Structure formats: C-alpha cells, structure tokens
Amino acid sequence: STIEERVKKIIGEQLGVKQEEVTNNASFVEDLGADSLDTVELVMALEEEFDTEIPDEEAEKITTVQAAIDYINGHQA
Ligand SMILES: *P(=O)(O)OCC(C)(C)[C@@H](O)C(=O)NCCC(=O)NCCSC(=O)CCCCCC
Ligand code: NA
Ligand SMILES: [Zn+2]
Ligand SMILES: [Zn+2]
Ligand SMILES: [Zn+2]
Ligand SMILES: [Zn+2]
Ligand SMILES: [Zn+2]
Ligand SMILES: [Zn+2]
Ligand SMILES: [Zn+2]
Numbered sequence: 001s002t003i004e005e006r007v008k009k010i011i012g013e014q015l016g017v018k019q020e021e022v023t024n025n026a027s028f029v030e031d032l033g034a035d036s037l038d039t040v041e042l043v044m045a046l047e048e049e050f051d052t053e054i055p056d057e058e059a060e061k062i063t064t065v066q067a068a069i070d071y072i073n074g075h076q077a
Pocket of ligand 3: 001
C-alpha cells in the first residue's frame with residue numbers, strides 16, 4: 001500500500017466518511033464535514049501512525065487531503 005492509500009484510509013475512519021468520498025482535493029471541514037474534536041483526533045491519529053509530531057499552528061493550515069499526504073511524505077522518518 002502507498003502513503004496515499006494509508007492516509008486516506010485513516011481520514012475516512014476518523015471522520016466516518018466513505019472511501020470514495022475522500023478525494024485528494026477534499027477539504028476536511030468544508031467537504032468532509034469535520035468538527036472541532038474531529039480535527040484534534042485526526043491530527044493525533046496521523047501523528048501516531050507516521051511517528052511524527054506536527055506543530056499545532058502548522059496543522060491548522062493543512063486543510064485538504066492532499067496537504068496531509070504531502071506533510072507526511074515530507075516528514076516521516
Ligand atoms: P472548533 O470550533 O474549536 O474548531 C473548528 C476548526 C477551527 C475549523 C478546526 O476544525 C480547524 O482549525 N481545522 C483546520 C483543518 C484541519 O482539520 N487540519 C488538520 C488536518 S490532519 C493534519 O494536519 C496532520 C497531517 C500529518 C501530521 C503528522 C503525521
Ligand atoms: Na506498498
Ligand atoms: Zn493498493
Ligand atoms: Zn458521506
Ligand atoms: Zn463531533
Ligand atoms: Zn504505536
Ligand atoms: Zn497537537
Ligand atoms: Zn491558530
Ligand atoms: Zn519510522
């Protein structure tokens with residue numbers, strides 16, 4: 001599996017949205033319906049899976065599925 005597939009799967013699971021709905025251009029809040037808690041829980045789920053901590057101010061600007069995939073490809077070690 002690819003990072004794209006693994007990140008999309010976690011997002012779908014965390015947000016309770018079907019896979020075909022988690023497109024690379026989808027906005028977590030505007031398109032996937034995420035609320036305040038969802039944001040906190042999503043960020044922590046991805047920090048655990050990919051073993052990397054993201055500054056909260058930085059996570060705040062990651063608004064789309066593609067932005068999350070990019071961060072991960074750029075920071076996981
Ligand atoms: P409530 O009213 O308090 O807040 C609602 C808002 C302010 C809209 C929050 O939901 C919010 O600020 N959302 C911003 C977008 C968002 O959900 N960002 C996080 C996406 S996942 C992420 O950034 C992690 C990527 C990888 C990190 C290391 C693995
Ligand atoms: Na693989
Ligand atoms: Zn595959
Ligand atoms: Zn849906
Ligand atoms: Zn909620
Ligand atoms: Zn663990
Ligand atoms: Zn945090
Ligand atoms: Zn802020
Ligand atoms: Zn590692």
